[PDB]
Symmetry: D2
Subunit: 58 residues, 4 copies
């Protein structure tokens, strides 16, 4: 039931910015659906965010 | 061919410390096999590391 | 007018946990008063947070 | 004796990329001279690095 798949382009909706491709997944009690996103601006740098923080873009 | 699975207890081998359970996975060109690890000391806090940075513990 | 000083013991108030000593400072438009905190559980690992996310403890 | 000052434009020398302005400082035993850098590509997002990881650019 994953919202995003590998390679989707996503951005953070608000606050500190982040944008790039989905490169992984994680799950905790605090964040039952989380994603790893590699920056499209800073190759190799990856952030993890809850699904609710992210939106898919073209 | 994953080295670790969900729930394995791992620690960072050197440098800044980190220890807890595997909670996810990611893959980039820089890090073709990476893991998300939730701290066992700081619930909810998650770091991502390359496989080579981590070792499984009891 | 800094809320915390070097060496203060602080914790994150909510969400993902973090606890340890103040080891630095930063300032952005999003976070005009921010602090670096070295984990007391994971030596060497440092997170940065806005002041509003942190509280001083004994 | 700080290598960089607030507002210097810096980049990470190798590995995962990062580039933007110095916005803060930190010091630990592992990293006796560290800096906070706000991405110029992703406003509001800040990483911390040891001085040896960074170089000043125009
Ligand atoms: Na991380
Ligand atoms: Na950082």
């Amino acid at each position: 039931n994953a919202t995003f798949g590998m390679g989707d382009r996503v951005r953070k909706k608000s606050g500190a910015a982040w944008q790039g491709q989905i490169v992984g997944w994680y799950c905790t009690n605090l964040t039952p659906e989380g994603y790893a996103v590699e920056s499209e601006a800073h190759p190799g740098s990856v952030h993890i965010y809850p699904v609710a923080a992210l939106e898919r873009i073209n």
